[PDB]
Each structure stands twice: as structure tokens, then as C-alpha cells.
Swiss-Prot record, chains A, B:
It catalyses: ATP + H2O = ADP + phosphate + H(+). The modification N-acetylaspartate is found at D1. The lineage of its organism: Eukaryota, Metazoa, Chordata, Craniata, Vertebrata. The modification Tele-methylhistidine is found at H73. It comes from Oryctolagus cuniculus (Rabbit). Coiled coil: none annotated. In vertebrates 3 main groups of actin isoforms, alpha, beta and gamma have been identified. The alpha actins are found in muscle tissues and are a major constituent of the contractile apparatus. The beta and gamma actins coexist in most cell types as components of the cytoskeleton and as mediators of internal cell motility. Oxidation of Met-44 and Met-47 by MICALs (MICAL1, MICAL2 or MICAL3) to form methionine sulfoxide promotes actin filament depolymerization. MICAL1 and MICAL2 produce the (R)-S-oxide form. The (R)-S-oxide form is reverted by MSRB1 and MSRB2, which promotes actin repolymerization. This is Actin, alpha skeletal muscle. Polymerization of globular actin (G-actin) leads to a structural filament (F-actin) in the form of a two-stranded helix. Each actin can bind to 4 others. Interacts with alpha-actinin. Identified in a complex composed of ACTA1, COBL, GSN and TMSB4X. Interacts with TTID. Interacts (via its C-terminus) with USP25. The modification ADP-ribosylarginine is found at R177. Pfam families: Actin (PF00022).
Curated annotation (Swiss-Prot), chains C, D:
Detected in primary breast cancer tissues but undetectable in normal breast tissues in Sudanese patients. Isoform 1 is expressed in adult and fetal skeletal muscle and cardiac tissues, with higher expression levels in the cardiac tissues. Isoform 10 is expressed in adult and fetal cardiac tissues, but not in skeletal muscle. It is found in: Cytoplasm, Cytoskeleton. The lineage of its organism: Eukaryota, Metazoa, Chordata, Craniata, Vertebrata. Belongs to the tropomyosin family. This is Tropomyosin alpha-1 chain. Homodimer. Heterodimer of an alpha (TPM1, TPM3 or TPM4) and a beta (TPM2) chain. Interacts with HRG (via the HRR domain); the interaction contributes to the antiangiogenic properties of the histidine/proline-rich region (HRR) of HRG. Interacts (via N-terminus) with LMOD2 (via N-terminus) and TMOD1 (via N-terminus). It comes from Homo sapiens (Human). The molecule is in a coiled coil structure that is formed by 2 polypeptide chains. The sequence exhibits a prominent seven-residues periodicity.
Amino acid sequence: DEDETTALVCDNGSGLVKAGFAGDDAPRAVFPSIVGRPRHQGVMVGMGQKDSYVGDEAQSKRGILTLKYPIEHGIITNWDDMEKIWHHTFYNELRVAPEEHPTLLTEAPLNPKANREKMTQIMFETFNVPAMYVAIQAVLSLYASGRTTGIVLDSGDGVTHNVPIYEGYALPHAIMRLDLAGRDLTDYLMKILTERGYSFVTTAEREIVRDIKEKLCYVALDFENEMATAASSSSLEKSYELPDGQVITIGNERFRCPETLFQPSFIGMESAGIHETTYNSIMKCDIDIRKDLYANNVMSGGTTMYPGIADRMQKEITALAPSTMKIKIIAPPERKYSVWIGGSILASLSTFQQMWITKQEYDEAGPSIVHRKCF
Amino acid sequence: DEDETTALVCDNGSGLVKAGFAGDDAPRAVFPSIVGRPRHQGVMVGMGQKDSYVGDEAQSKRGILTLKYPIEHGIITNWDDMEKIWHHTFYNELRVAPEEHPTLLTEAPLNPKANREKMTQIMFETFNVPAMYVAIQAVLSLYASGRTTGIVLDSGDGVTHNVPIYEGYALPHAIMRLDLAGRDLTDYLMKILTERGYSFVTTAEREIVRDIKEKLCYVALDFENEMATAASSSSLEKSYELPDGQVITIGNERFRCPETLFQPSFIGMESAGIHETTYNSIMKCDIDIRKDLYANNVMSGGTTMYPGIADRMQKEITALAPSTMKIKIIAPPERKYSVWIGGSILASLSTFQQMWITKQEYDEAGPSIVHRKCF
Amino acid sequence: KKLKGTEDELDKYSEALKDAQEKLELAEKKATDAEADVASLNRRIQLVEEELDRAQERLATALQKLE
Amino acid sequence: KKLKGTEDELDKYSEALKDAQEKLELAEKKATDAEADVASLNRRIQLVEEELDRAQERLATALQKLE
Ligand SMILES: Nc1ncnc2c1ncn2[C@@H]1O[C@H](COP(=O)(O)OP(=O)(O)O)[C@@H](O)[C@H]1O
Ligand SMILES: Nc1ncnc2c1ncn2[C@@H]1O[C@H](COP(=O)(O)OP(=O)(O)O)[C@@H](O)[C@H]1O
Ligand SMILES: [Mg+2]
Ligand SMILES: [Mg+2]
């Protein structure tokens, strides 16, 4: 722990938890949001026999544990799970006590207000954090980009959000949430791999196939033409070496998996591709600034490490929108940490401690005070 | 079909289509303006496999159809959709042939003249109606009220129109259209319910939440005081039984949804509440008759089935306007059919057939004849 | 045995259907009656409201003329 | 096979009974609300009518005094 009473910066992103100290450039403890629990009961002795398993421990013990998600698309299952994982993060991973450091947290866009009131109340009772602040990840990604104008595409693991912000101002009237995310990607890839001869249901293979998505997946420039040329495609077809050692070969599926988000009709969504969701979002607001939105679009999330989103994005928007002004996307490398960086940025300036949510305000007005203290 | 050659009366209201015969008191075939299409392609056989689904058929088949709106705020997407739905209405629902009956139609206020010319031309070519007349729904609601003086607030599902008419004469200089309507209501309620923990995007839940608006919604007498007392409000908070069986509880939202039309700044409109739009409309015209406009205001539309519009209306107008003369609103029960009733009224009198738009006039002067034949 | 339950349920469900359907007929008839009554009452109270309005303007005229 | 046919009829009655109960309940609640509205609207009409009568006596005296 630093000698100074600097604040805690924790991004509880929908899919990854990244925690550390204020003034740091990158979060120190970063782990996926999976939680493992003993698949069977206790009869043995001498070691183990522990209920909750979180972090890399559960990653190593994936096979023996039922792998469960305490949060999915924002919905909260069991607050005890968050209690334990935050205990682990603060003491076993961050080696910090929350008594002496206020916490800045980031929440998924348009999270329930009742969810905020319950989570804040359990937090304040269970923990002894001196002060509090929670913010939407959209403005955090904006801060990471450091440009007040643009539309943020936050692609988490449970929801994809499109949020327009012009000159550092939120536009909730033109903000939308789409239920397509990593979960859907894994599902669709699971069914295609089932049609390829490999049919698995458990979560270990879920992580294997999301790793495959991280490594080999394409974003098709032209879809049906690329499957037409991918009929044989000995060179274009790509293989992976699974940890057991078998060589699993995939061809068109590499660019047929992210295409489900672009073409939702593959597995039955009324909503069109996410580019249509950015398009409608843009026109809902006044006409004039729309061009700037076209030229200032930002994309954020862990998924963004994949190739192909930028070219597809620009080409389709130019197809939909007039091609007079030039559209260009901006995306700094390793932007999944960017939100946490913005949290540090929030703690950088000396005005931030004017609106810390202190203990006594919550003791006076209950959780309801946040309704007036954040917004 | 009646032995007599009486005319067809069809109200294509922005949100509902109500069709029947002249001389009838209520329209026979009434259906919402939603249109369903197959969400996927055809591989099965033995039943179904039909493209267009309209009326109660689509209402029953909402889940497997992409639900699309052939008209939104007056704008026309695809004339083929109107062709099919009119075919369905005339033959499958009204069991009538348009060959032997002239048609009286009602159109949304200030509808495009190009829209009128194209719709009339496709109509005359596709169909074989002997004669035609189309009128604005404002004077139809006036006829339903049967009083030549008043300002009509037409609250459709795409637009809300304020139109003043004094002694049975239209005042286009003081007529305005506001882009707030049922769509906005559903949207705003969708985002609030998202903040309540329930986040849906599809149209089935759109119809569920508009049903909730039909049943439980309030119009707040005082807004912030009613949320202040609605903090707990065990009695004031009201619940609904969704068809799946879950009990969904809503409190202040009941009167925080229609308030948005009155308070557009909630989701960002420069225009103030609709009462301001009626106020400005009134002062635009000569001072003297304004008092009569205050005392003769009429409201029309399906939304009017909700409570609270009358009290709010009068109180705010009295706040804005001097309180010497007494302001009173008039609104007959089941006024969403009233327009169609007025259509029957038009066919009641024997002068109406002096200005039927016959086939030969259109054949001579093309569609352009309507420019001289209606106005 | 499976068949006796089949028939037992058939008989019970049949009698329940008759009772439910007669109840439906009476409920529908009462609904139509009361809806017609509601429409007549709505027309009448509209009449009385406008009449009260008429009384108000004429009262105003009398009080200004007297002044 | 006979049992299949009888079960089909049994099923049809089961669904018809469920639908019948729901529609019966909807009609009954609708028309109970309608009858309550009938009584309430009767009282509203009578009160506005008495107000109107009172206005008529006042207005009669008003016209006399004007003259
Ligand atoms: N190094 C990486 N390369 C590619 N994809 C990644 C990488 N790390 C994480 N992801 C993907 O990002 C997803 C988690 O998204 P996350 O960054 O938590 O969203 P948010 O920005 O809302 O917190 C995971 O499902 C995973 O598939
Ligand atoms: N019985 C009802 N009770 C309450 N609201 C209704 C009812 N029927 C229709 N509506 C509302 O009316 C809207 C349709 O308006 P509509 O009557 O078509 O406008 P217009 O008068 O311009 O035709 C729908 O969005 C629906 O929410
Ligand atoms: Mg994200
Ligand atoms: Mg209307």
C-alpha cells in the first residue's frame, strides 16, 4: 500500500474486473468475471475443500468447478458472489484495505437504478470505504480517447451499447443496448462447430472457443463471396492447436462468427446489425452534428482486439450515409484497460474530491442520496 | 354486402385502420397498423408459408414475425403493404368489393401532397373504386363533436396535431404538428423499465407496455411532489400481471410516462409541452375569439382513453391564460371511432355525391385533378 | 385404470364446460346490458354538463346586465 | 387407439374450459365495472341536474330583476 491515501480505481466491466490504485497507468489485478464452485461434495481431507474459487485459481480449476456467472448482461444473481470476489481482489490480489481509500467504480451503461441502490447499500454496510463515486463506462472510454465529441460503441461480454456524446454531453435519448455480446458469439460458434463434428457444452470448451475467436477469427469483407471462395481455400483455411494436442481446422467460420452481430437474422433478432443501431442512433439527434458523429465514432471493449471491425464499420456507414465527408474510426491499442485509465484520470484532478460520496451522506439519506449525488 | 350501393367509409388513422359501410354507426373492421413478415425462410411444408400477415392474424403471430410499420408519422415505406392490407380489409374483413362503392377516406393532418398524388394514382390503377373523397381527420373529429368552433388536438400514434377551427373554417396558419406520440411514450417507458431492471427491445414487449399504459398509467397532478410521496407509496404503487404470469410493479412511472409529452425536456425536445403548442396556436390568430377557443377545445385520438389529460389540460391553460372565463374540455366516450362516425355523417347527406372524385376526372387530368377537386 | 380416469375426467370436464359456458352467456348478456346503460348514461351526463355550462353563461349575462 | 380419440376430445374440452373461464372472468369484471359506473354516473347526472335546476330558478329571478 502506498503511503498516501490515494483512491481505489476499479472497473467492474461486464466480462472483466480490473482494479488498482489511483495515479497508476494500468490496473494491477485484472481477472475474468467467471466464478467456480465445487461440482461435488466433501469426503476427502488434507487440502482444498473451499467453496468459492475466483480468478486464476478458478481458471486452473475450471474442470472441477461448475463455472457460473454472477452477472450476465447486467443482471445480478447473488450479491454474496460479488462480496467474495471483491474481498479477494482487495486483500489477496490488490493487498489493500478499503478503509483508507475511496473507491471510483465504473458500471455498465443503463444499469438498473434499483441495482445501484442495493449494491451501494450492501457495499456500505459490508465494507468500510470512506467515500464513493460510480460512473458510466461510456464517459470513461471518452476520457481515454480524450475527445468530447463522438459515439461510443461499448462491446462488453453481456451487452453492446451505442451512446452518442457531443462536446462532452450525454445523449440518453439516442442511447441503445443490444443483447448481442461475447456470449452470443460463443453460442453461434458452438452450433457451427457442432455442425463441423465437434459438440461440447461445458464452459472449458467455451473458453477454448473464445480463445479461438481471439486468435483466428476474421471479419469478412464480402460474406457470401468469401464462403464461395472458401469452399476449398486450402491457404485461406486456418487451423488451431488445442491444448490437448489435436489440430482443429476452421475455414469460413472464422469470418462467419462475428457476422452474427452484423447479420442478426442468422439466429433470429428483429434488430438489424450494430451498424444500423449506430445509424439510427445518429439520426435520432439533430441533423447538423451527425457528420461529426460520423467522423468521431469510437469503439471500446475487449472484443475490439479482433481485426476487421474498423474496415467493416466505415464501409457500411459510408454505404448508409452520404460519402461526402470522410469517416475515420479511432481505437488506441489495449483499450480494454482504457476505462480504468480514465478512472485514474478522474482521480488525477483536485476537483474530484468535491463530490466523493462520503459515509455520513449515506447514513443521513440512505441509499436514496445517490439519486441526487451522482445525477 | 348491402343491396344498396352505399359508400365505403375508411379511417386510415395513424395507428389504427377502421373500415366499414356508410350509414353504419361504428366501423366493422378495426385493426392496428402493424404488419408482420416471416422472420426466417421456408423449408417446412403443409401449412403457413405466407409472406404478409395483417390484423389479428399477425397479433397472434407476433413472436415469429418481424413486426414493421408501413407508416410512421405519416411517412410511407412501401405502397405494396397498403395494397395488401386494403385487399385484406375489403375482402377478408369487410367482405366487400370496391367496384360498386365509392370510398371516403381520412388522412393524417398536413400529409404530403406528393404522398396524396402517388397514393391516389396507385389506388385508382390497382383498384376499381367508382368514386373518391379524402378529408383531414380534424374536421371529421369536429363533425363527431358537432360544433363548428374549437381547437382539435389529434393525438395519433405517430404525430400529435393542434388545429384551430372557428365557425367551421380551418386555420392552417395556426396549425402545428409535434413528433411526440405513442412511439415516444413506449420508448420513454422502455428506458424507464430498463432502469427498473427489465430491458426488452422487441415489439411484443412494445405492445405489452402500451397495454400497461392503457391500463395503469396516471397523469400526475403535481409531478415532483408525487414522486416525493411515491418514494414508498405501498398503496399508490400499482402492479400488473403480465401474460407469462410474472407480477411487474410500477410506481411513479405510471405518471412519469405521459408527463414527457407535457415536459419534453426529459428526452430533449426544443418544443415545450403540448399545452404550450395549443397556447401559441391560440394567440397566433386574432385576440378576440381566443376566449372561445379556450372554452371550446376538443381532444381526439385513441390515447384519449387514458385519464388525466382533461384536468391537466384545463389547469395549465388557466395558469397560462387569464382565469376570467371558464375553460371546459369536451370528449365523448370511445372517440377513436368518432372520425369514422363523421365519415358516415358525410355520406348521410345528399349533397356529398356532388363532389365524388369519379374515375373519368382522374383519367382526364391525372392525379393532378385532386389539387383542384378537394381543395 | 388409465381409461377410468380418462372417462372420469371427460365427464367432470364436460359438466364443468357446461357450467362455465352458461356462466359465460350470462356474463356476456350482463356486459351488453350494462354497456348499453353506460352509453346512455354517458350521453345524458354530456347533456347535463353542457346544460350546466349554458346556465353559467346566461347567469353571467344576467349579472353584467344588472350591473 | 380408441383411447387416443377419447383423449383428444378430453384435451379439446380442457382447452375450451380454460379459455371459457378466462373469457368469463374478463366479461364479468368488465360488466361489474360497467354497473359500478352506471350507479356512479346516475348519481353524477342527478347532482348536475339539481345544480341545473337551481341555476334555472336563479336565472328566472335574474331575468325578473333585470326587467
Ligand atoms: N486480449 C484479448 N483479445 C481479444 N479479445 C479479448 C481479449 N481480452 C478479452 N477479450 C474479450 O473481451 C470480452 C470481455 O469484454 P470487456 O472488456 O470485459 O467489456 P467491457 O469493456 O464492457 O468491460 C471477453 O468475452 C473476451 O472474449
Ligand atoms: N382502448 C384503448 N385504450 C387506451 N388507448 C388506446 C386504446 N385503443 C388504442 N389506444 C392507443 O391509441 C393509439 C392509436 O391512436 P389512433 O386512434 O390510431 O390515432 P388517430 O386518432 O390519429 O387514428 C395506439 O398507440 C394505442 O396506444
Ligand atoms: Mg466493453
Ligand atoms: Mg389521433
